[PDB]
Amino acid sequence: SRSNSGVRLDGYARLVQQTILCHQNPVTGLLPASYDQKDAWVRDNVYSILAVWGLGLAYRKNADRDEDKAKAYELEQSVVKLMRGLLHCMIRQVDKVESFKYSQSTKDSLHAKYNTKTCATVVGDDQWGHLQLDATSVYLLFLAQMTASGLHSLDEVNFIQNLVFYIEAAYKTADFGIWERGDKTNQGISELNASSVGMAKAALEALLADEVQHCQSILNSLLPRASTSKEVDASLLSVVSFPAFAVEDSQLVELTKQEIITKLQGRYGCCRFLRDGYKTPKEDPNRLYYEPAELKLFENIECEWPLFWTYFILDGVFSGNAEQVQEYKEALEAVLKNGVPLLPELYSVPPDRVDEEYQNPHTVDRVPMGKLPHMWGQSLYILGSLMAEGFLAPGEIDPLNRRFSTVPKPDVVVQVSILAETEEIKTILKDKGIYVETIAEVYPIRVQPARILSHIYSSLGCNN
Amino acid sequence: ETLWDKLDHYYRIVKSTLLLYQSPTTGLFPTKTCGGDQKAKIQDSLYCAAGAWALALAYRRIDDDKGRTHELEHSAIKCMRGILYCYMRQADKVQQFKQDPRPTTCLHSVFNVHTGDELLSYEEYGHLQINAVSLYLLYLVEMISSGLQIIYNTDEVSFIQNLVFCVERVYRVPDFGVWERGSKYNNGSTELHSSSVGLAKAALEAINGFNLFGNQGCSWSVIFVDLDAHNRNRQTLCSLLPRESRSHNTDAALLPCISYPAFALDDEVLFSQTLDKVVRKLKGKYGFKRFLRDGYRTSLEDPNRCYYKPAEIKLFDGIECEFPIFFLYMMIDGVFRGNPKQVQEYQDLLTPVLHHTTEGYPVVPKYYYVPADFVEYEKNNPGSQKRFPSNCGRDGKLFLWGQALYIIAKLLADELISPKDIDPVQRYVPLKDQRNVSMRFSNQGPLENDLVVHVALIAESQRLQVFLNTYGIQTQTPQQVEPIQIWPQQELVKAYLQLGINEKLGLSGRPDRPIGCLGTSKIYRILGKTVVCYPIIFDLSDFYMSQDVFLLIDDIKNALQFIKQYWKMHGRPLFLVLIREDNIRGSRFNPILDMLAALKKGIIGGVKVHVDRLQTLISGAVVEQLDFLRISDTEELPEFKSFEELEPGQQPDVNISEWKDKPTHEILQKLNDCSCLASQAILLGILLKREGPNFITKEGTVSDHIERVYRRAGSQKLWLAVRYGAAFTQKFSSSIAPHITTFLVHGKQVTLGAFGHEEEVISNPLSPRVIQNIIYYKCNTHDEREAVIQQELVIHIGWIISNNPELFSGMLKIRIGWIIHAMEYELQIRGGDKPALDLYQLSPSEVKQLLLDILQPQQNGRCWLNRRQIDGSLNRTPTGFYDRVWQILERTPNGIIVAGKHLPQQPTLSDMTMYEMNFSLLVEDTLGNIDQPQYRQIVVELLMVVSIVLERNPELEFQDKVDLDRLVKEAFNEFQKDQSRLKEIEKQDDMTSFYNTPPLGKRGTCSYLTKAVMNLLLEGEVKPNNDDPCLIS
Amino acid sequence: ETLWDKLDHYYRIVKSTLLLYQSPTTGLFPTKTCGGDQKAKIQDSLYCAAGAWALALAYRRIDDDKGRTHELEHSAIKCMRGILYCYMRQADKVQQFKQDPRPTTCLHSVFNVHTGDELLSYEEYGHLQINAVSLYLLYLVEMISSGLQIIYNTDEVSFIQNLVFCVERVYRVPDFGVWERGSKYNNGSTELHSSSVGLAKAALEAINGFNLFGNQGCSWSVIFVDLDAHNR
């Protein structure tokens, strides 16, 4: 394997080490967002370790010598370390998981940012809009997937099931979104984003199916629209495709992808959503919120994010494709340091050229700003490259077969037992031709009302 | 005394009495220290090299050795790279021995000490001593582990592998043994010796995965043993373990095996059962007898005649030569096993028998013989006479093997070497440490066995995975596990064919056999990809047994139970339950779903299982890295195909006899008017004979129409046709031969052949093609439907012998034709007046339940005519039947005649011992001519009664030959007379009434027989006996 | 009694009286089972993790553990990757202690069980207990040898080496000791204790040449002790 596949694997090892693993904290295992943003986002940390997990998987499928075993073990244990660090980040907020379990309020939600040096909390609850069901759901989904891939207390198992209850009611819980700003208007208004709902559905499926299919109902109804205040969000690729695969309707997935391509895709990536204005030259940089009258200003000049084209390579790899047009179009990578791609966070219309871009959409030569490299995007870029170059397979990143969601599922035959409450009732049912068994006869199977089932689950997840 | 002085004492003895004799050229040591004999025996050189290495292990504890560590160690390498040379020159023979292990294809075990050339030929000497090839490999592992570099290049590694391929199949190669003669009788006969199989189990346990380069080693220097072949050696040793062979109930060669150097046995109760018999029956003042009735250099032995003639073996009883070396092995066993008083007891026994050379160096005489003038006195009072040494050392004669063992034992006893030092590979595992030693002990320990096999349910197609999920079972298609490759076992057999391939030495590779359930239960890294293999149970086959799903579910349970009982490797076993869409077709779905569901629950057959995704199951598991494949000659890596997703009558009316007397094209006429796939198989099977392989049929070549009817009724589950088809097309299963070895490894002998027809006796392991002649041509020449049913029972009995061995206890010769007879009768007794079902129409699984039911301990309830017919037909013997028949022969001067056979007191009493397995076979041969199976049970009962009368009454002894048939006839005639007095039954010479009478009861069968035996015994002298001298006399 | 029953007796005692108390977050166990003290002593957590690992070593002799080998072993890793966290946050102090081993430059030996932060200061508590850094390293070697994977990346290996550079020069750093007081007199005085130097001789004998990666390890994961400092 070292002839012509070990050298390229080592090249990707340098890529991941110099883009991702260089910034992993030896104490906590978390990844700071950038030099300016020293805090560690849950979702960004979960996504940024995908390249490391894929490299470890690559290294292992070819680990026979020691050195190769050493590299594979180092990568897998770095992934385990990052997930454990995020766990103690959530574990320290068990009082918030417990409170959000019953009262799903934005003031009782897990924080998105954490101190990358102590796994503690950096800002106050009031200070970031921490409710992001997608970050906790993506963490749970990849915890399920990594474990199903062979990556290894019961107290944290109880905590994980309490997190399952935490993200369980995500179909009816308003969220601050994957972009941690709620609605577009950007007034800190919690809103129900299909991205969060789909990620929660995927996490629950990978890890009670009633709320799962409630999330499925939300997804079917909302798609191809993102949420109440969004025609389309490019984050929906994380639901209709990798990593959630939460939509089992192939037509709906295709329609969502086509909406993203038609509305948000530009010369430098896909805009997050219409009238985003995250790093546009028209916003006020020092003003946190957005007045309702400046959202027009953001139209046709929204920043295009290269991160979303990593999703379009991932699907295309997960679903076989000649979408080798999404790759070869990511020549818009910063350095070709030495030659490291350094996938940018976004491209903004140069300020002078606002009128030309407004008028002539997706046509002006934008500049890269924001995080560089975008580790969430860079990890997906490296993973897609790995997968596309034959060093990885969909079944290794997805051992739970989440990709097989779109396949039509056959109708199910519901077995029903008609049970007589009393024997006299059984006698009447028989005179009329339905041969049944009484609830006493069905012993040792004990029939109970659904209230008892709901009460039983109240004893699941309890560690006092 | 300083250590230098303490060990200079041994260096003087080693250098004078052992290393002086080492060949300057070969490195091998000479058997005769003084003389013109050029013989270097393989075993004695290995023990001599071990003696020099033991001194080096001692001199390693001194930094200023003055060169003695390098010399003594490099002398050991010299002897071991000299045995390798002798073998490497005879590598034309290593290839021939892997393919056809035989007495005349073996590596020679005696070579010219000076040149390394073959000295004695196959006729002159019995060279098949696999104790020697196997101790070469145990010592090479134990010395390479110590730091001694014996294997130098990859070609030497390929020869050591080819040497391993030979040592794996020892269970099926009978040999001459450490003693070079075979049995106590020097008939020129090879027999399986626990000692040879035990050393092979130990070489294989030690060499599996041993870098033969040592510390300076990589993946391409490792030796790979077959977990399945090693199991077959473990199974053979344990079914011959308080004993040594069919001939020897104890041999002192068991002591080298059970304890240093091999330390093979893994049961502490068998070690004690084996050692105690060896010490009790073989120990002497001057040493341990090699075996009882041994004629080596005895005064009564004829020097000129090589082969002892029948009954000569008696002349050597009490005159047996006693070898002082066994005292040294017992001292080494004591140092290892922590008995500081077994070292002293046997040191004290050796200090007297030890001669000393002129310079004071101790000489361990090879044997101590009774001088001829004193032979009768020893025979009269054994242990009384004084036996002269064989070599005194001053004579110029030294036993180089014993000289070496003195150094090993004296150094170990004096604590100048440690048990750990001379057993670098830990062959001795102290009880408290018998937990995680691969191929021997598992985490659970020596006694507990609740293994959880790691099941992975793999589905042939996505369609089947989605179908199985709807019905409750999550399975994974071959593609969903993408990096992991699921391979048929046969694709690993192709890969292994490239292990040990040296074209310089003419070596070829692993022999092409099936990898089994303990080798398909491992995860392999072959050419950079992870390969897990589906078990051989899931391999498609022509035989009709495959069609019964119930047999597949049972083979899955049977395999997992074998994996539980016999997998002692580090990882959890990985069983992959390949599910094929054919398996769920029709009503096979309900049985398969219950197996698949129990596999999901975690228990199928008492074997706990963990079904999980292969990726999770293969994750931190130990993977056997198959690095021998390399690129080799071809610049391309070998092409290995991996399982891939398969993407989308009531009775035959035509009777054979009335339709075979016809030669007519009319058989081809009914062929067009037979809808019965059983009438078609009978009609289109008469013609595979009379008209030919291709006599044109309306359909086409006849060979194609029977294979179409066999295959068609196989699916339509029309089992009479499937069996007429298999037989007519002469179908044999790959598993008949692998299972017939379960019978043989377990000490049982299979007879194929019908009841009332030519039987044949497979007493030794045989090839599939020899076994096939025995079933379709040599034994069954009247009905070949019998060969398919007999093939069906060998497969069923073979797994029953492996997993439930005691459903076949009291059975030594398993007569499959007789067992089928018991089954046809059980169908009639079960049937009642309603006609009995035809065993042939019964489904393979229904034939397995009939067998399991007939084998079930006969319980209070059935007619004693039915109990007898089943027991007699199964040839079940009451426990100790064979020992009790010895006691009848010992107290009967002229022997027992049964059914025109005769067990005479001599030559058997003279040539055999009470518990000899050879005797059990002679008793079984004597009762061979008993055609009727219920008569066999009455004859087995007369013999059991004759044993109680003779034992309870020690005074009575038979004068003339006991005719067991006459004693039975006289018992029936008394019964006939007494029952006549009750009700005058008019049936004559019908013993049905007698057989139905219970054995013990008011007037049962046991009374009549006791009476008959007593009338015969009392017609002869009553010897006054002294145990209870007569009070009224 | 079956082994399952014999060892379920210890799992009930371990789970009630030891693993109930393990911090959900740090992995460290609390010195006071009941109360508002947040002190997790380093030595007591190591002895607690060793107790869970000893039960896992026992449950390894049963194939149907029902998850108890993974939990009891992974509890031990939790406590040991929690002491490492407490030390790894205080690695500004590991550098200062290698250069100037002193009572006020040491890694703290009592940390917040809930957060892993320093609880008592150098004035409040005598944190120079090299029995603790040294038993961390003896137990990390004894647990990584067992099959328990505690060190995950090269940076954790570099901290364990820097922890070793500190444990080598113990002969010249007087400490407070297992008993936290120093001498019989609680004068606030550090003295060389055979117990602290003895555990350091043992951590150094065990960790010289040890792949901290275990079986999944290479040359770049080995810890290197100074034969001369060990001699001292």
Ligand SMILES: C/C=C(\C)CC/C=C(\C)CC/C=C(\C)CC/C(C)=C/CC/C(C)=C/CC/C(C)=C/C
């Ligand atoms: C499973 C089968 C069984 C339990 C066997 C059942 C036993 C039966 C049918 C009877 C067996 C009887 C036996 C062995 C013998 C009897 C005796 C006491 C014989 C005496 C013969 C004799 C003439 C002795 C001389 C007495 C002396 C020495 C006088 C001084």
Ligand SMILES: Nc1ncnc2c1ncn2[C@@H]1O[C@H](COP(=O)(O)OP(=O)(O)O)[C@@H](O)[C@H]1O
């Ligand atoms: N059809 C089969 N069913 C079960 N086990 C088999 C089969 N074929 C081979 N094996 C096993 O494979 C191993 C080696 O195969 P083979 O050389 O045929 O064995 P043997 O010589 O004992 O018949 C043995 O453990 C044997 O039992």
